[PDB]
Amino acid sequence: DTKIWNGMVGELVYGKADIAIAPLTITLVREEVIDFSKPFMSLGISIMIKKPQKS
Amino acid sequence: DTKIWNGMVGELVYGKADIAIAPLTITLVREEVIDFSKPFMSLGISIMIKKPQKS
């Protein structure tokens, strides 16, 4: 409704922070409001399961 | 010696091509001469072996 970026983006768009070195997902809506560097950590959705156990 | 980029970079730096949509490794020496987009295909050096031959 207010279309206010909160968080670290709201600290970068509104000038409260000079840069954000943090785990931050580069999305297209975040791309248009702040300039990202090239990604240092490629990742994605992964599968966490228990380790198998003898039974 | 001549410090001439060949290839598609030599087609982009020297204006012979307007854009390069191609499999192209984003390196730092290539970053300074042409502007890359954010990477669409994260990858790296992988291990190709034969499939096991259980018979």
From Swiss-Prot, chains A, B:
UniProt-annotated location(s): Cell membrane; Postsynaptic cell membrane; Postsynaptic density membrane
Where L-glutamate binds, per the record, is at 23, 25, 30
Q: How is it modified after translation?
A: Palmitoylated. Depalmitoylated upon L-glutamate stimulation.
Tissues of expression: Detected in forebrain. Detected in dendrites of neuronal cells. Expressed in the pyramidal cell layers of CA1 and CA3 and in the granule cell layer of the dentate gyrus.
Q: What induces it?
A: Down-regulated in the pyramidal cell layer of CA1 in the hippocampus by global ischemia.
Q: What else is known?
A: The postsynaptic actions of L-glutamate are mediated by a variety of receptors that are named according to their selective agonists. This receptor binds AMPA (quisqualate) > L-glutamate > kainate.
UniProt similarity note = Belongs to the glutamate-gated ion channel (TC 1.A.10.1) family. GRIA2 subfamily.
Q: What does the entry's free-text domain comment contain?
A: The M4 transmembrane segment mediates tetramerization and is required for cell surface expression.
- According to its UniProt entry, what is the function of this protein? Ionotropic glutamate receptor that functions as a ligand-gated cation channel, gated by L-glutamate and glutamatergic agonists such as alpha-amino-3-hydroxy-5-methyl-4-isoxazolepropionic acid (AMPA), quisqualic acid, and kainic acid. L-glutamate acts as an excitatory neurotransmitter at many synapses in the central nervous system and plays an important role in fast excitatory synaptic transmission.
Q: Subunit info?
A: Homotetramer or heterotetramer of pore-forming glutamate receptor subunits. Tetramers may be formed by the dimerization of dimers. May interact with MPP4. Forms a ternary complex with GRIP1 and CSPG4. Interacts with ATAD1 in an ATP-dependent manner. ATAD1-catalyzed ATP hydrolysis disrupts binding to ATAD1 and to GRIP1 and leads to AMPAR complex disassembly. Interacts with GRIP2. Interacts with GRIP1. Interacts with NSF via its C-terminus. Interacts with CACNG2, PICK1 and GRIP2. Interacts with GRIA1 and SYNDIG1. Part of a complex containing GRIA2, NSF and NAPA and/or NAPB.
State what protein this is by name: Glutamate receptor 2
Task: Please spell out the taxonomic lineage of the organism that makes this protein.
Answer: Eukaryota, Metazoa, Chordata, Craniata, Vertebrata
